[model samples]
Target: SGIVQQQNNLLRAIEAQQHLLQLTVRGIKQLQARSGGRGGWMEWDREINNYTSLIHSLIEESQNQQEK
Candidate 1:
């Protein structure tokens, strides 16, 4: 409702997105050990789902800031 809340909202969204990206990177690194999917697509598909979910959550948070 005020300038301070707006500031915090921006910070909150930025920090939340940052955390989500870091987690996504960590997840990708975990999958990288496969180095080329020697096993199969099951694991790879799971990772894709996880990453997409994280991205979706970020988008939701980014747009939901109620003026603060």
Candidate 2:
């Protein structure tokens, strides 16, 4: 269905975005040290958490819909 397709697209986008966020955080930590870029890393971490939560929710919803 179109709904399933849309969810698939959204899930892929979220995954990709989260990947970029994590990569950025890793690069920042490597270049500036874990505590040196404290504020920037922490902010990126928050966004990563949010994205992870969203990705979980999306998968959950997708599974529920498939079962239904």
Candidate 3:
């Protein structure tokens, strides 16, 4: 039961991260449309990349937990 609960929690976290990643990507797109290489888009792009890295790390952790 404990392992099942942990897996469930990890899945929820991954799902939440996925949603956040989607939002971040959308924000980057919007920023690009408005900024158009004026340098503001770089901030949003960095944010998106950061979120992507975080999501990847979360997925790795989840996979490791599942293996145990």
Q: Compare the candidates by lDDT and give the number of the best one.
A: 3
Error of 3 at 27 (Å): 6.7
Clashing pairs in 1: none
Please give the range of 10 consecutive residues that has the lowest summed lDDT in model 2.
Answer: 32-41
Candidate 2 Cα outliers beyond 4 Å, as residue runs: 34-68
How do these models rank on lDDT, best leading? 3, 2, 1
lDDT over C-alpha atoms for residue 39 of model 3:
64
lDDT of each: 0.71, 0.72, 0.75
Q: lDDT tens digits, residues 1-68, model 1?
A: 57776867777687787778779866876776568753566686688679778877866675667434
Candidate No. with top TM-score: 3
The order of the candidates by TM-score, greatest first, is 3, 2, 1
Per-residue lDDT of model 2, residues 1-68, tens digit only = 77878867877787678678678867866876744766656776688689778877876676566635
Residue by residue across 1-68, what tens digits does model 3's lDDT show? 87788877868887887888688777757767885674656775687689688877977787776755
Model 1 clash number: 0
* Candidate 3 residue pairs in backbone clash: none
TM-score winner between candidates 1 and 3: 3
